[PDB]
């Protein structure tokens, strides 16, 4: 409830499910994938788009039912003169799978000759640098994109949502609901006590 | 594997490192322009040294990839300017000889003092405001007898060195090397060979000749009263009575040639003082102009990084009118904003140049330039010409809906632009054509000054007031020759200025002449212009020209429709003088 009307995120979009129905819906596993990219490559992050990011880095399924959280971070981790703190792989000899972290750090072989790790002919260096500078345009500013994945299995989900609790009124024959039991009657005072677990 | 597949991988590796090195060389140059210090100079040389060293290494590895193995019709156009060797294509012994001449010609031209006197605006104001025969002649003869003599041995060796340098990159001569920019080497069908550039230019120049004959006869008959024993109505005009040292800018001759003195011209200087512009404005007005055309809005970093103020004489700055392109979405314009009349049209001219850079923003660094050298300047000429219309400036903020205007007012506007736009047009057609015959081998080494004065009386109409010999040299003393800059790019700028204006004014529900066209509330005329700007160099200029005008070849008809009321008035006025100019005539 406080994440939608926060009035502090640059891009807050959801796919698959509605952003107002997941507040009370139960979820089994709630993942959190954070990554800083450019400002123009944000359009590639969508369930149904490709590019040099959703293919060789962080790949997302086409039927992703979640939300995409991304805000502006120009006055945070950005300096003038050239950004050399974030890297990214340009090409790779294979195609990654959705929900998989890049572990193998090899050299892209464009030709038919082995590279043996050393950079040379037909052995380009895939890890390139960005350019997060406060004097560039809009498509060159860093944006911390956080992707929240919602996956439900057969295990009992323990992460649901808070319930809006009202007040308590008696002396009337109205309807009430006290945890599961939904009765309609007049709530009067009692003298007996129950058990501290029932 | 695949040669074409490995070609795109080599481009992505170079583009990710070229934008970082080029930005550091441009950011250090911006700090020197804001504050002239001795520290920012070393920052640009260190950043520029890494760019020249990295470009040479990538040009050698690009020679292994065949050029014919490109099917996308895009990589072939990018590897043409990458596999070049530059001036260092010859041997190591002749490498320092060619670069030394480029420094000797630029030093004498910059230090050319007449005893004292500076260069610009030193000798420019003397040859303009003088009105005397025994004053401006001494300033013109001393420049050809001192500067031309020292540049004579350097100009002779400049032809033999540039001839072998051009042939080393598979060409013909120096003039043929400049023809490769206009040559189509990508999409088939819409090709444009280098041999076609020889023709067309020579055919369209003959149809515009009757327009120049009526203009040259009116100026000669007007200045006849000032020089009765020197300017004949049936003769010609000397080389010093043109209001310029080299006969390039003829705008200064408008003060001594007024066809109507009873109708004042437009003036937007007093209108800016009444409405009180903060001196930080002008750009705010210039912003809403391109919105009504339909070109997208400007960026956000332009209003926070580009210095749009005037510090004055208390701060060292060199706010020269030059559009900068740092890259990576950054766009800055270096210009001192003042509350005058010339700055209102100058800001609109450079705003069209930075708009072209914003079109191909998503394209790589190898596609961040115009289609040719004569096309990037034509984008800003159509913006300042449409904004200089007296009718367009009346329906906005400045000016008065009370200022009357008629057919007599448009005569003074077409004549003023005829001494700058089409005034230097015959000079460009003669200066560039004369050098093509020397660089190729059609003129002997001892007939340079002989053929020079022969082509003047047949194209422009300029005689020699002083009988020169052979050791003299005239084209060597020029800002574009000493700096090794092409001059053919200015010829296509004049022709393409009226072709793009006629296309936008036609779809905007407006017919007739083009001296009163107003580009406002015309969405169709704005979306069509963005078609060829977004492409850039990915498509040839012949295909991009058809999307706006409708033809692949340059035309001269739109250049005549703009000066239609001016050509009509000169017909019923130049009846007492001779239409044209005489060749066998000398003032001495």
């Amino acid at each position: 409830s406080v994440l939608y009307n926060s009035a502090s995120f640059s891009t807050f979009k959801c796919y698959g499910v509605s952003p107002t129905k997941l507040n009370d819906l139960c979820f089994t596993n709630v993942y959190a994938d954070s990554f800083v990219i450019r400002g123009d490559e944000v359009r590639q992050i969508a369930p149904g788009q490709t590019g040099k990011i959703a293919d060789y880095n962080y790949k997302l399924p086409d039927d992703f039912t979640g939300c995409v959280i991304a805000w502006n971070s120009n006055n945070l981790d950005s300096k003038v003169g050239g950004n050399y703190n974030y890297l990214y792989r340009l090409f790779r000899k294979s195609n990654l799978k959705p929900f998989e972290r890049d572990i193998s750090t090899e050299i892209y072989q464009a030709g038919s000759t082995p590279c043996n790790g050393v950079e040379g002919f037909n052995c380009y260096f895939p890890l390139q640098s960005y350019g997060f500078q406060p004097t560039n345009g809009v498509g060159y500013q860093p944006y911390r994109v956080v992707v929240l994945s919602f996956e439900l299995l057969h295990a009992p989900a323990t992460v649901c949502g808070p319930k809006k609790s009202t007040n308590l009124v008696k002396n009337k024959c109205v309807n009430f609901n006290f945890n599961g039991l939904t009765g309609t009657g007049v709530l009067t005072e009692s003298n007996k006590k129950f058990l501290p677990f029932q | 594997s695949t040669i074409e597949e490995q070609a795109k991988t080599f481009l992505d590796k170079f583009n990710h490192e070229a934008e970082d090195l080029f930005y550091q060389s441009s950011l250090a140059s911006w700090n020197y322009n804001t504050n002239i210090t001795e520290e920012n100079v070393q920052n640009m040389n260190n950043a520029g040294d890494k760019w020249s060293a990295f470009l040479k290494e990538q040009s050698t590895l690009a020679q292994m990839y065949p050029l014919q193995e490109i099917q996308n019709l895009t990589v072939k156009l990018q590897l043409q300017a990458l596999q070049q060797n530059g001036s260092s294509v010859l041997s190591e012994d002749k490498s320092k000889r060619l670069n030394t001449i480029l420094n000797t010609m630029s030093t004498i031209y910059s230090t050319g003092k007449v005893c004292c006197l500076l260069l610009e605006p030193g000798l420019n104001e003397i040859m303009a405001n003088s009105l005397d025969y025994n004053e401006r002649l001494w300033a013109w003869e001393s420049w050809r007898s001192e500067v031309g003599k020292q540049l004579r041995p350097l100009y002779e060796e400049y032809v033999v060195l540039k001839n072998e340098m051009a042939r080393a990159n598979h060409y013909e001569d120096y003039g043929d090397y400049w023809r490769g920019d206009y040559e189509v080497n990508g999409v088939d069908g819409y090709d444009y060979s280098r041999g076609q550039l020889i023709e067309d230019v020579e055919h369209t120049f003959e149809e515009i000749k009757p327009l120049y004959e009526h203009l040259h006869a009116y100026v000669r008959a007007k200045l006849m009263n000032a020089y009765p024993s020197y300017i004949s109505p049936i003769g010609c005009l000397p080389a010093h009575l043109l209001g310029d040292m080299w006969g390039r800018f003829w705008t200064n001759l408008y003060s001594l040639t007024v066809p109507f003195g009873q109708k004042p011209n437009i003036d937007v200087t007093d209108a800016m003082v009444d409405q009180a512009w903060d001196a930080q404005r002008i750009f705010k007005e210039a912003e809403k102009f391109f919105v009504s055309v339909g070109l997208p809005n400007m960026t956000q970093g332009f209003w926070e990084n580009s210095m749009l103020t005037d510090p004055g004489n208390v701060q060292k700055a060199v706010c020269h009118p030059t559009a900068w392109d740092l890259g990576k979405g950054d766009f800055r314009i270096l210009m001192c904003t003042k509350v005058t009349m010339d700055d209102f049209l100058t800001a609109h001219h450079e705003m069209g140049h930075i708009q072209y850079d914003m079109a191909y923003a998503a394209q790589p660094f190898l596609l961040r330039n115009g289609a040719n050298e004569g096309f990037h300047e034509a984008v800003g000429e159509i913006m300042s010409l449409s904004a200089a219309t007296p009718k367009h400036l009346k329906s906005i903020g400045l000016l008065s809906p009370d200022f009357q205007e008629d057919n007599e007012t448009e005569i003074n506007f077409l004549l003023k632009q005829a001494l700058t736009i089409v005034g230097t047009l015959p000079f460009t057609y003669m200066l560039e054509k004369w050098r093509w015959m020397v660089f190729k081998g059609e003129i002997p080494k001892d007939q340079w000054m002989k053929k020079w004065w022969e082509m003047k009386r047949e194209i422009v109409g300029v005689v020699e007031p002083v009988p020169h010999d052979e050791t003299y040299c005239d084209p060597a003393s020029l800002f574009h020759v000493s700096n090794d800059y092409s001059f053919i790019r200015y010829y296509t700028r004049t022709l393409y200025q009226f072709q793009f204006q006629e296309a936008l004014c036609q779809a905007a529900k407006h017919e007739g002449p083009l001296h009163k066209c107003d580009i406002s509330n015309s969405t169709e005329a704005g979306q069509k212009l963005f078609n060829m700007l977004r492409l850039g160099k990915s498509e040839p200029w012949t295909l991009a020209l058809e999307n706006v005008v409708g033809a692949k070849n340059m035309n001269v008809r739109p250049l005549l429709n703009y000066f239609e009321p001016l050509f009509t008035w000169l017909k019923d006025q130049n009846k007492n003088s001779f239409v044209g100019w005489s060749t066998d005539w000398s003032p001495y």
Side-chain angles (χ1 to χ4, degrees):
Chain A
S1 180
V2 300
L3 300 180
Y4 205 172
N5 58 90
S6 180
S8 180
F9 301 93
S10 180
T11 300
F12 184 84
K13 299 180 180 180
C14 297
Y15 299 92
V17 300
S18 300
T20 60
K21 299 180 180 180
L22 40 75
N23 182 86
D24 53 354
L25 182 60
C26 301
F27 297 95
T28 305
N29 298 277
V30 181
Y31 301 94
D33 302 330
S34 300
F35 56 93
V36 180
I37 52 181
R38 293 172 55 186
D40 196 13
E41 297 177 348
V42 188
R43 302 180 182 270
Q44 299 181 2
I45 308 300
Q49 299 291 152
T50 59
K52 300 299 181 60
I53 302 300
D55 295 355
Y56 296 154
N57 299 330
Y58 181 83
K59 180 180 179 181
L60 71 162
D62 300 330
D63 56 330
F64 183 82
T65 60
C67 298
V68 179
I69 300 180
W71 61 90
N72 180 269
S73 60
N74 181 268
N75 300 330
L76 298 180
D77 49 357
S78 179
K79 60 181 180 301
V80 50
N83 181 270
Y84 300 93
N85 300 330
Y86 303 93
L87 301 180
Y88 66 98
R89 181 169 301 182
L90 186 57
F91 293 105
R92 200 176 71 92
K93 300 180 300 180
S94 300
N95 300 270
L96 290 175
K97 300 181 60 180
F99 296 155
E100 181 181 2
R101 182 180 294 101
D102 189 9
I103 303 180
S104 299
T105 60
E106 59 182 1
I107 302 300
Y108 178 80
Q109 179 180 358
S112 180
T113 170
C115 299
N116 300 121
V118 62
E119 180 180 359
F121 193 81
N122 295 334
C123 300
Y124 303 93
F125 202 80
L127 299 179
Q128 298 292 150
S129 59
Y130 287 93
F132 299 150
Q133 299 178 178
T135 60
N136 297 337
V138 182
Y140 293 86
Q141 297 180 180
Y143 288 92
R144 300 178 179 180
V145 183
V146 178
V147 180
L148 301 180
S149 180
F150 296 154
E151 181 181 2
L152 287 76
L153 290 316
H154 295 354
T158 61
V159 181
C160 298
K163 181 62 63 60
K164 299 298 298 180
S165 180
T166 60
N167 300 121
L168 180 60
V169 54
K170 301 179 299 181
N171 300 331
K172 293 186 301 182
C173 188
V174 300
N175 183 24
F176 55 91
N177 194 330
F178 293 156
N179 184 268
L181 178 58
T182 305
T184 301
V186 180
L187 299 179
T188 60
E189 300 291 339
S190 180
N191 300 120
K192 60 180 180 300
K193 300 300 180 180
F194 293 158
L195 300 179
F197 61 94
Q198 298 183 359
Chain B
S1 60
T2 301
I3 304 300
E4 184 179 359
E5 181 180 0
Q6 299 181 184
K8 299 180 179 60
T9 306
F10 183 81
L11 299 180
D12 299 330
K13 181 61 179 180
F14 180 82
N15 295 326
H16 292 181
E17 299 183 3
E19 300 180 358
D20 191 11
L21 300 180
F22 184 82
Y23 186 85
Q24 299 293 150
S25 180
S26 300
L27 181 60
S29 180
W30 182 267
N31 300 330
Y32 177 81
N33 299 330
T34 303
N35 185 19
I36 301 179
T37 56
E38 300 292 337
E39 184 180 0
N40 299 329
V41 183
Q42 300 180 0
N43 300 330
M44 183 180 60
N45 300 330
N46 296 330
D49 192 12
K50 301 179 180 180
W51 174 263
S52 300
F54 181 79
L55 183 60
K56 184 60 180 300
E57 299 180 359
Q58 302 298 121
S59 180
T60 303
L61 300 180
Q63 299 291 343
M64 301 180 180
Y65 295 155
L67 186 61
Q68 299 291 152
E69 298 292 338
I70 299 300
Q71 300 293 340
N72 194 266
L73 302 181
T74 302
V75 186
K76 183 180 182 300
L77 298 179
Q78 301 181 10
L79 298 180
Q80 182 67 22
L82 181 60
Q83 299 180 0
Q84 60 180 0
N85 301 120
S87 60
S88 60
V89 72
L90 301 181
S91 300
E92 300 181 1
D93 179 70
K94 299 181 299 299
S95 180
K96 301 300 180 180
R97 181 78 282 181
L98 180 59
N99 299 122
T100 306
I101 306 180
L102 300 180
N103 297 123
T104 57
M105 298 179 60
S106 300
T107 303
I108 303 179
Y109 181 82
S110 300
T111 60
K113 301 180 300 180
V114 180
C115 299
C116 301
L117 298 179
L118 300 180
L119 180 61
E120 301 179 359
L123 300 180
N124 299 269
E125 300 293 337
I126 302 180
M127 302 300 300
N129 299 270
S130 180
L131 198 60
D132 184 71
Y133 186 84
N134 300 270
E135 178 180 352
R136 62 191 302 179
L137 182 60
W138 177 86
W140 182 87
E141 184 180 1
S142 60
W143 182 266
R144 273 68 176 88
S145 300
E146 299 179 0
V147 184
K149 295 298 181 60
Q150 300 181 183
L151 298 180
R152 180 61 180 181
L154 287 314
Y155 187 82
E156 299 180 0
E157 300 181 1
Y158 185 82
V159 183
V160 61
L161 292 180
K162 291 298 182 180
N163 184 24
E164 185 68 22
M165 176 268 181
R167 294 179 298 181
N169 301 120
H170 298 352
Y171 288 100
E172 299 181 0
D173 55 76
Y174 198 11
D176 184 70
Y177 179 81
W178 296 349
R179 301 179 180 179
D181 193 8
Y182 301 91
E183 180 183 2
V184 176
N185 300 120
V187 182
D188 300 70
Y190 309 96
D191 300 0
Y192 186 87
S193 300
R194 299 177 300 182
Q196 189 68 20
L197 188 59
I198 302 180
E199 321 167 339
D200 308 1
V201 178
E202 300 179 358
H203 297 351
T204 60
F205 187 80
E206 300 293 336
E207 188 175 357
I208 206 62
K209 179 62 63 60
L211 179 60
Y212 180 81
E213 297 180 359
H214 296 67
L215 180 60
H216 180 269
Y218 184 81
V219 182
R220 180 178 59 181
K222 181 62 62 180
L223 279 70
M224 184 180 60
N225 300 120
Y227 301 92
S229 60
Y230 302 96
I231 299 180
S232 300
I234 34 76
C236 182
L237 297 180
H240 61 273
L241 296 180
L242 300 180
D244 185 70
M245 179 62 61
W246 302 272
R248 178 173 54 180
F249 291 96
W250 293 355
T251 311
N252 300 271
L253 299 180
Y254 184 81
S255 300
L256 288 315
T257 302
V258 179
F260 299 93
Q262 292 77 9
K263 180 62 62 180
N265 300 333
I266 58 180
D267 183 71
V268 297
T269 301
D270 300 329
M272 299 174 58
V273 187
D274 201 333
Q275 299 182 182
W277 300 33
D278 315 350
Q280 209 291 143
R281 280 168 34 76
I282 299 188
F283 304 93
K284 294 304 318 167
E285 302 302 347
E287 180 183 4
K288 301 179 181 180
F289 177 79
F290 298 91
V291 179
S292 60
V293 179
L295 298 185
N297 191 270
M298 303 300 179
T299 61
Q300 184 66 23
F302 177 80
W303 303 90
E304 299 180 1
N305 300 330
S306 60
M307 180 180 60
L308 304 182
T309 59
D310 198 333
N313 60 273
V314 299
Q315 181 68 21
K316 288 83 180 180
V318 279
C319 48
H320 296 278
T322 300
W324 298 92
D325 188 7
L326 287 78
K328 299 183 301 180
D330 180 70
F331 305 94
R332 299 178 181 179
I333 296 180
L334 178 66
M335 179 183 300
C336 285
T337 302
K338 300 182 283 79
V339 195
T340 56
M341 182 180 180
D342 300 330
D343 295 69
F344 184 82
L345 300 180
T346 306
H348 296 176
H349 177 59
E350 297 286 63
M351 191 60 60
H353 297 170
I354 199 62
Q355 179 67 20
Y356 203 0
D357 303 357
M358 299 181 180
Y360 39 73
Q363 301 294 150
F365 184 82
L366 297 181
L367 299 181
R368 291 182 177 180
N369 195 272
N372 50 274
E373 57 183 4
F375 186 81
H376 180 59
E377 298 181 357
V379 184
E381 296 291 339
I382 63 180
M383 302 301 180
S384 180
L385 181 60
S386 301
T389 301
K391 184 180 179 180
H392 180 269
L393 297 179
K394 184 179 60 60
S395 180
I396 53 177
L398 49 68
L399 212 51
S400 64
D402 300 70
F403 181 82
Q404 68 284 351
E405 59 180 0
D406 58 330
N407 59 272
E408 300 179 0
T409 306
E410 301 292 338
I411 300 300
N412 300 330
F413 183 81
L414 297 180
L415 183 60
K416 180 180 180 60
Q417 299 292 340
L419 301 180
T420 302
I421 302 180
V422 301
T424 180
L425 183 62
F427 181 81
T428 304
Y429 179 81
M430 182 270 176
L431 179 60
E432 187 67 284
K433 184 62 62 60
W434 179 88
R435 299 185 301 179
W436 290 359
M437 301 180 180
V438 182
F439 296 153
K440 180 180 180 180
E442 300 180 2
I443 298 181
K445 301 300 180 180
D446 60 330
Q447 297 183 186
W448 291 353
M449 296 296 102
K450 180 180 300 180
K451 196 60 180 180
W452 178 267
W453 299 106
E454 293 180 352
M455 301 301 299
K456 287 292 187 180
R457 303 177 181 89
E458 300 179 0
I459 298 180
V460 183
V462 175
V463 300
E464 45 177 1
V466 179
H468 295 172
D469 296 334
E470 186 69 24
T471 59
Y472 294 86
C473 192
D474 299 329
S477 301
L478 188 58
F479 183 82
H480 297 69
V481 181
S482 301
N483 300 330
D484 191 70
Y485 290 157
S486 180
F487 201 76
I488 195 60
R489 59 184 301 179
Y490 296 91
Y491 187 89
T492 60
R493 178 182 58 90
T494 302
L495 277 70
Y496 294 157
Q497 182 180 0
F498 300 95
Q499 296 180 180
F500 295 153
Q501 180 67 21
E502 188 271 346
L504 271 63
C505 296
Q506 179 180 356
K509 302 301 180 180
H510 183 61
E511 299 292 337
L514 300 179
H515 69 82
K516 65 271 184 298
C517 166
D518 302 330
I519 302 298
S520 60
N521 299 120
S522 302
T523 308
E524 182 181 0
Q527 299 180 178
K528 184 180 60 180
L529 184 62
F530 192 75
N531 291 13
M532 65 176 182
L533 269 63
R534 186 180 60 90
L535 301 178
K537 294 189 298 298
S538 59
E539 298 293 337
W541 62 273
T542 60
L543 181 60
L545 186 62
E546 186 180 0
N547 298 18
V548 178
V549 180
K552 301 180 300 300
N553 184 23
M554 56 182 60
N555 300 330
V556 83
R557 181 60 60 180
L559 286 76
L560 185 60
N561 298 18
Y562 182 84
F563 298 93
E564 181 68 23
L566 181 60
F567 180 80
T568 304
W569 184 85
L570 294 178
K571 182 61 180 59
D572 297 71
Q573 181 68 19
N574 301 330
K575 60 179 60 60
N576 60 329
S577 180
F578 183 82
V579 180
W581 59 91
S582 180
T583 60
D584 300 330
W585 181 89
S586 300
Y588 59 94

